[PDB]
Amino acid sequence: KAKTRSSRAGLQFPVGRVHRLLRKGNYSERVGAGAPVYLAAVLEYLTAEILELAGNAARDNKKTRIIPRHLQLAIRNDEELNKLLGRVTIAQGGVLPNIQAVLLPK
Amino acid sequence: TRSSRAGLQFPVGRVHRLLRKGNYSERVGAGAPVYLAAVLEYLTAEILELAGNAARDNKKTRIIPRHLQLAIRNDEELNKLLGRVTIAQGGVLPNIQAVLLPK
Amino acid sequence: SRKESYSIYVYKVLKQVHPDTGISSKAMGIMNSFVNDIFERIAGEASRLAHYNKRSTITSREIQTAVRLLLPGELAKHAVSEGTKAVTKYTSA
Amino acid sequence: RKESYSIYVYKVLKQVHPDTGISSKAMGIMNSFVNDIFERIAGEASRLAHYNKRSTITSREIQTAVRLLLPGELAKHAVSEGTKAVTKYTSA
Amino acid sequence: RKVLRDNIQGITKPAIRRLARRGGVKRISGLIYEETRGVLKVFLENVIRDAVTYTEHAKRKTVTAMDVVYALKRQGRTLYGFGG
Amino acid sequence: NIQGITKPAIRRLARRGGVKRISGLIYEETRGVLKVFLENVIRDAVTYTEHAKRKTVTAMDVVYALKRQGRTLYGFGG
Amino acid sequence: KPHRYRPGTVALREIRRYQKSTELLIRKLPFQRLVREIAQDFKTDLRFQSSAVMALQEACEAYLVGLFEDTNLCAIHAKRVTIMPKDIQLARRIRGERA
Amino acid sequence: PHRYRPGTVALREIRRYQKSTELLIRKLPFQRLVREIAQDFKTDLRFQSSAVMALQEACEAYLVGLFEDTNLCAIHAKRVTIMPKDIQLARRIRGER
DNA sequence: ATCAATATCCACCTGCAGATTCTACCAAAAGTGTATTTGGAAACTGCTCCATCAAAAGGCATGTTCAGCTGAATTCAGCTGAACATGCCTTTTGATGGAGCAGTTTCCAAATACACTTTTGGTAGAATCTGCAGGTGGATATTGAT
DNA sequence: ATCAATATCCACCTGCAGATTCTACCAAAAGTGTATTTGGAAACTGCTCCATCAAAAGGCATGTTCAGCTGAATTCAGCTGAACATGCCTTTTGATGGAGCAGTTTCCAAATACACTTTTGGTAGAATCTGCAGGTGGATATTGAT
Ligand SMILES: [Mn+2]
């Protein structure tokens, strides 16, 4: 039959859509062979990283549908992801519940 | 010379080659290489006329780094364009907080 | 007028880490935007090394070293992992 | 080999100020400058390309780009010298 | 339709207040309101300008979301959730 | 080693910076940010040297990651 | 009484509140209007995608809230507990938006 | 004997270094520092004498600029002496830490 | 505000070596001549998506008291960090050399680009589903007055 | 130390607007059999780059002193937060009309590919030259005392 390349690497993302968006992207004159794979991979991985951290957020909040907020929460709570998407903003995301201690009563 | 047809000092060809060899787009128009060369020129021109004045103001006749940095961070626009660029051997413009001064 | 997205693909990766969980449309949105961003940051960074190294072709090697530079901490350690692996699998058979 | 913008900055220096010359290190600063600005405009010019499903970087893509990249009157006068140079190269 | 004018005073004071609480501020100085507006206005201008420039370059008459998205990216306010 | 960057030298860097007076603690803290800086710049630069399959760190190597870091430098390569 | 909450008590209650939610605080119609006005004075007779406007609004609502934190962290730095123009202006300078 | 009042030198020191353009840190300990750090990244490395000016030119510019921003904070708190406190506020604002 | 006695900048002058600038020539491009492919401009034109109005309702924005307690102006003083003249060692620096090593080449075997042809996996509808938005109320704090 | 007075919580509810499935076409992966190049893998110069070696000279580290800057405690003029009430205008729902994206078609006017042909732009000597860099002599800027 026919082996979808994404299958050879055993990934979920489309390795071939990745090869194509790469070539016609002008990032370079000629595209390697495992380049489309390796990248689909990092992308798959990072995609399942912010996924899980957010699912839980749905669980923490007693909901089964992941919504923006959860994602925002997921990001701004993991030191590393918070970092990678520093200058990025999530439509509907909200902000982390944080009060400057000095302002609290006593 | 292609560049002469436009009366520019900067090399139009070099640019046309720098574009087709930059992975910028699949094919480059002819207007581009020129337009840019001129735009590149005009700006270096702007930076010099303004640094010349700088050098002449010091009593030197040779443009050093500091002569450039002065011209740059003193022109509101040039400071904007190069806001996130740092010049080696340039220093800062002499500015002291009034609150620090005596009286 | 058919326009694409990584929609199916994220979704596949969603039932994988959280079988009994589902994602909202707006979220799926926030998702496609992410993937595309990263996708640009990396290929774009690796695009630079090529020029920098007078190399005509972006291999899976550049991608990596592009990932090193672009990703922070373990995220990148664990990152390169899934990739080298994925590519070591691919080529093999 | 290993080419540079040197001659060009020097020629333009001798027009605005015939009596003046430049240092080495300063010549260098200037080199970096040209390079950078180039890169910024060619970049924003490439995006305009891809962005518009277009496949060719016209001069229209350089200009418009320079409107987004260059501030205030630094931009207008920039666009001018560009339209200029191009108007002249074309006729004859 | 009807002339648009002095609308920056539509960004009510109560709203600015709210916006500031989500920020964390507990006590708001008098002058703040006007200041904010000024700063908000300058924002929108830069962003809208750029965006439209993307509408004007695509030879369209309608400003699309991308148009907006694309520009917010130039100002590094990279936004997610509006067109990939 | 970092201790090579002497207190007086720091005061000078401070001076140009427009600082009139200086706490005694700064010095330790100043060195801190200084390390972190050089640390991030150099590493990103090395990666370049290394990816380049070379063993010596060129001017560019610095310049390049210097850009990747937002801090762009003129007069050292282009 | 009448039952009055001391000052500041409601302010904290508002912070916790709006920080738990995610709805755009500026009222939509005026924002929109303001958008067309500004854009009016740049290019005459334009059209706006329903989504385009929200995008703008989402981005602004955002900026300001974040500029508001930095501002706040500045007010604290000067022993105060009231944000001011003085505070806002510093923050934007350090930020470089107008150094 | 004649002693100069306090900080009068500080102002006379400030105008000086601002009127000058020479790296202040001492050239050898720095380069020394450079190699040390870089050595935790890769071994038996070599640098270009130039790459080191690059690594000193850069560093120093950040430091001078970081200071300007530290001043504007200390002044802002009614004070007139940059403290470790002033230095973080300025950094958390810029978006570094 | 002056008077004088330190210490300081700061012009004025001025001489040669590290540089700047000017020459004198070779490959590497840049520029032609011809001959090919193409991108995307112009002219329909189908048809969403956007602009405007209406209407009724209630959700806020305004504007006005009132006063709690935050910002700001004082006052006081412990003590930290600038100015110094001292004493000493680590940066400066000046070659000098041998060699680790960026860089050149010269093949070529392996990995890409190509050009078609089947063969799916993805995208854009409708058909079915079902989390969860919006209300409803008791249960708990959490406040603020006595 | 008590109690109202409110605002925050949390689980139960229940129709429906936003997914989740269910189903066909078709643009774009995949499979093949050529037609290139690309980028190392030995082979090897010339650099630049470590490292040793050897003296002064600032430049740094100390240890003395105390001027004046940063903090803590009061005080109060009054600014800004919390209510309340008044009624304006932002929502919400729906409907049209058509301006103007977008999807096709059709093709010149414009950009690309080789094979040569011309000059220019980068090097490494060869010929100047501007400051660096000292060195006084003259207000300048300071600081302490009447
Ligand atoms: Mn108007």
Residue numbers in the entry:
A (entry chain C): 13 to 118
B (entry chain G): 16 to 118
C (entry chain D): 32 to 124
D (entry chain H): 33 to 124
E (entry chain F): 19 to 102
F (entry chain B): 25 to 102
G (entry chain E): 37 to 135
H (entry chain A): 38 to 134
What do the authors of the reporting publication say about this deposited model?
The H2B N-terminal tail passes between the two gyres of the DNA superhelix. The H2B R31 and R33 residues interact with one DNA gyre, and K30 and S32 form hydrogen bonds with the other DNA gyre in the wt nucleosome. The H2B deletion of residues 1–24 affected the structure of the remaining H2B N-terminal region, in which the electron density of the region preceding the S32 residue was missing in the tlH2B nucleosome. Concomitantly, the H2B–DNA interactions that involve the K30 and R31 residues were disordered in the tlH2B nucleosome. The electron density corresponding to the side chain moiety of the H2B R33 residue was also missing in the tlH2B nucleosome (Fig. 5A and (B)). Therefore, the absence of the H2B–DNA interaction in the tlH2B nucleosome (K30, R31, and R33 residues) may alter the DNA trajectory near the binding site, and may affect the nucleosome stability. The N-terminal tail of H2B directly binds to the DNA, and the N-terminal truncation of H2B slightly, but clearly, affected the DNA trajectory near its binding site. By contrast, in nucleosomes containing tlH2B (lacking residues 1–24) and tlH3 (lacking residues 1–27), the initial phase of disruption clearly occurred at lower temperatures, as compared to the wt nucleosome. Altogether, the removal of the H2B N-terminal tail seems to destabilize the extensive interactions between the histone and DNA.
